[PDB]
Design an enzyme around this catalytic site. Structure first.
Site, PDB file in Angstrom:
ATOM      1  N   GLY A  81       0.885  -1.650   0.299  1.00 43.62           N
ATOM      2  CA  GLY A  81       0.013   0.414  -0.134  1.00 43.62           C
ATOM      3  C   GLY A  81       0.360   1.263  -0.009  1.00 43.62           C
ATOM      4  O   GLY A  81       2.050   1.115   0.248  1.00 43.62           O
TER       5      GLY A  81
ATOM      6  N   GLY B 170       1.678   4.390   1.901  1.00 40.23           N
ATOM      7  CA  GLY B 170       2.308   4.667   3.111  1.00 40.23           C
ATOM      8  C   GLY B 170       2.597   6.896   3.293  1.00 40.23           C
ATOM      9  O   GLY B 170       2.298   7.287   1.868  1.00 40.23           O
TER      10      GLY B 170
ATOM     11  N   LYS C 271       9.378  -0.493   2.355  1.00 39.63           N
ATOM     12  CA  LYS C 271       9.807   1.099   2.531  1.00 39.63           C
ATOM     13  C   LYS C 271      10.294   2.034   1.495  1.00 39.63           C
ATOM     14  O   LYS C 271      11.491   2.220   2.469  1.00 39.63           O
ATOM     15  CB  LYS C 271       8.264   1.699   3.164  1.00 39.63           C
ATOM     16  CG  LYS C 271       9.950   2.095   4.650  1.00 39.63           C
ATOM     17  CD  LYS C 271       9.190   2.445   5.975  1.00 39.63           C
ATOM     18  CE  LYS C 271       9.872   3.016   7.278  1.00 39.63           C
ATOM     19  NZ  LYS C 271       8.969   3.201   7.949  1.00 39.63           N
TER      20      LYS C 271
ATOM     21  N   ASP D 229       2.451  10.776  18.038  1.00 38.82           N
ATOM     22  CA  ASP D 229       1.838  10.257  17.080  1.00 38.82           C
ATOM     23  C   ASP D 229       1.441   9.062  16.781  1.00 38.82           C
ATOM     24  O   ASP D 229       1.463   7.728  16.241  1.00 38.82           O
ATOM     25  CB  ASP D 229       2.454  10.620  15.461  1.00 38.82           C
ATOM     26  CG  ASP D 229       0.852  10.596  14.208  1.00 38.82           C
ATOM     27  OD1 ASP D 229       0.190  10.628  14.888  1.00 38.82           O
ATOM     28  OD2 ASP D 229       1.397  10.353  12.631  1.00 38.82           O
TER      29      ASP D 229
HETATM   30  N1  LIG Z   1       4.895   1.295   6.910  1.00 42.63           N
HETATM   31  N2  LIG Z   1       3.611   0.064   6.239  1.00 42.63           N
HETATM   32  C1  LIG Z   1       3.365  -1.003   6.888  1.00 42.63           C
HETATM   33  N3  LIG Z   1       4.722  -1.529   7.057  1.00 42.63           N
HETATM   34  C2  LIG Z   1       5.088  -2.834   7.353  1.00 42.63           C
HETATM   35  C3  LIG Z   1       4.772  -4.351   7.625  1.00 42.63           C
HETATM   36  N4  LIG Z   1       5.815  -3.905   8.321  1.00 42.63           N
HETATM   37  N5  LIG Z   1       4.365  -5.407   7.509  1.00 42.63           N
HETATM   38  C4  LIG Z   1       3.638  -5.275   6.960  1.00 42.63           C
HETATM   39  N6  LIG Z   1       2.714  -3.809   6.047  1.00 42.63           N
HETATM   40  C5  LIG Z   1       3.506  -2.548   6.389  1.00 42.63           C
HETATM   41  N7  LIG Z   1       2.656  -1.475   6.056  1.00 42.63           N
HETATM   42  C6  LIG Z   1       1.580  -1.292   5.518  1.00 42.63           C
HETATM   43  O1  LIG Z   1       1.407  -0.965   4.504  1.00 42.63           O
HETATM   44  C7  LIG Z   1       0.823   0.159   4.431  1.00 42.63           C
HETATM   45  C8  LIG Z   1       1.353   1.694   4.127  1.00 42.63           C
HETATM   46  O2  LIG Z   1       1.974   2.228   4.755  1.00 42.63           O
HETATM   47  C9  LIG Z   1      -0.035   0.003   6.136  1.00 42.63           C
HETATM   48  O3  LIG Z   1      -1.329  -1.043   4.757  1.00 42.63           O
HETATM   49  C10 LIG Z   1       0.691  -0.506   6.805  1.00 42.63           C
HETATM   50  O4  LIG Z   1      -0.321  -1.623   7.321  1.00 42.63           O
END
Ligand SMILES: NNc1nc2c(N)ncnc2n1[C@@H]1O[C@H](CO)[C@@H](O)[C@H]1O
Length: 338
Positions: free
Chosen positions: A22, A24, A44, A139
């Site tokens: 997704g 972020g 990310k 946050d």
């Molecule tokens: N930084 N975000 C993030 N880290 C994650 C991680 N370590 N394992 C699994 N999903 C991860 N997300 C997902 O990415 C999307 C955009 O932020 C959202 O749906 C989050 O839940």
């Protein structure tokens, strides 16, 4: 290089078989196969270098997460970037792959009281470590709490974090603020810069209430509206609590309001454990000086099944234009070269 959703995401050759998760706060998030550790990971993509504030958040997130080591705080496993500053346009942060976050979970899943208790325990356990490092997260909200398939919880995203500075916390009425509106403590709108640890406890109180009902407790639609949601449930602050607000503009705003009675927690949450609501009341206390602190929250009867201070570790030690910040980010990520 492997591409995803039309844009570059070059993490190879170590990380392959990419899958989009997704979008972020920083950019694109994918899962991938770590060919070295033989596991899938989350990655990310961060592209901050045009802007002071972007580079600010990125440096905070990297610096803090590389220094913290705690079961309930997400780690950084790897950072991918070009070998030179000149060639560095993006930074990829590799982290453990989690199953979901609490925001996504609360959209569709009712939590058992056992889950609420375990989640809250883990949030506070992680926060004890953060606050022991003299750091404020600033946050905390469901989308910044990751969960794996066995419901282990990790606090993420320290891009808005600061070192605590309680002696410089006072400010005027309606002072602008960045952190997420629904989780903002009442004093942010009244007289606080959010430089004390009580700011985080308020957010956790909001998260607890949201776990109890799968709805945000204070869903304000704009800045001052947030305060009128908070007061609509807590009721009018006492004279003692008003006397603690010396700023006249803030105090007189509160004095201008008609009397509001407190809404009893057990009326709002008729299915909730009574011990959970007792702790909720102490976290959502209007006066930040009277608000419960993280180590007291851990010792609350609601958390008795889990509380063990010897197993709730603390930090070993307490914790500019874009061009210097790119240089700092390059320096902070050097250990992963290569
Ligand atoms: N930084 N975000 C993030 N880290 C994650 C991680 N370590 N394992 C699994 N999903 C991860 N997300 C997902 O990415 C999307 C955009 O932020 C959202 O749906 C989050 O839940």
């Amino acid at each position: 290089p492997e591409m995803v959703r039309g844009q570059v995401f070059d993490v190879g050759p170590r990380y392959t078989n990419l899958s989009y998760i997704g979008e972020g706060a920083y950019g694109m998030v994918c899962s991938a196969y770590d060919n070295l550790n033989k596991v899938r990971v989350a990655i990310k993509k961060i592209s901050p270098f045009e802007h002071q504030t972007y580079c600010q958040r990125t440096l905070r997130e990297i610096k803090i997460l590389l220094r913290f080591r705690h079961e309930n705080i997400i780690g950084i496993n790897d950072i991918i970037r070009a070998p030179t500053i000149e060639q560095m346009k993006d930074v990829y942060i590799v982290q453990d792959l989690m199953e979901t976050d609490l925001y996504k979970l609360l959209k569709t899943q009712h939590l058992s009281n056992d889950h609420i208790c375990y989640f809250l325990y883990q949030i506070l356990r992680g926060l004890k470590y953060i606050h022991s490092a003299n750091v404020l997260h600033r946050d905390l909200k469901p989308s910044n709490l990751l969960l794996n398939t066995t419901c282990d919880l990790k606090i993420c995203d320290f891009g808005l974090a600061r070192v605590a500075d309680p002696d410089h916390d006072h400010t005027g009425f309606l002072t602008e603020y960045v952190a997420t509106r629904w989780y903002r403590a009442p004093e942010i709108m009244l007289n606080s810069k959010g430089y004390t640890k009580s700011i985080d406890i308020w957010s956790v109180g909001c998260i607890l209430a949201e776990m109890l009902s799968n709805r945000p407790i204070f869903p304000g639609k704009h800045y001052l509206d947030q305060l009128n949601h908070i007061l609509g449930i807590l009721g009018s602050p006492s004279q003692e609590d008003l006397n603690c607000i010396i700023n006249l503009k803030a105090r007189n705003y509160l004095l201008s309001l008609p009397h509001k009675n407190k809404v009893p927690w057990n009326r709002l949450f008729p299915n909730a454990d009574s011990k959970a609501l007792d702790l909720l009341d102490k976290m959502l206390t209007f006066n930040p000086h009277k608000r419960i602190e993280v180590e007291q929250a851990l010792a609350h009867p609601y958390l008795e099944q889990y509380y063990d201070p010897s197993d709730e570790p603390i930090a070993e030690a307490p914790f500019l234009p874009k061009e210097k910040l790119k240089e700092l980010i390059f320096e902070e990520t050097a250990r992963f070269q290569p």
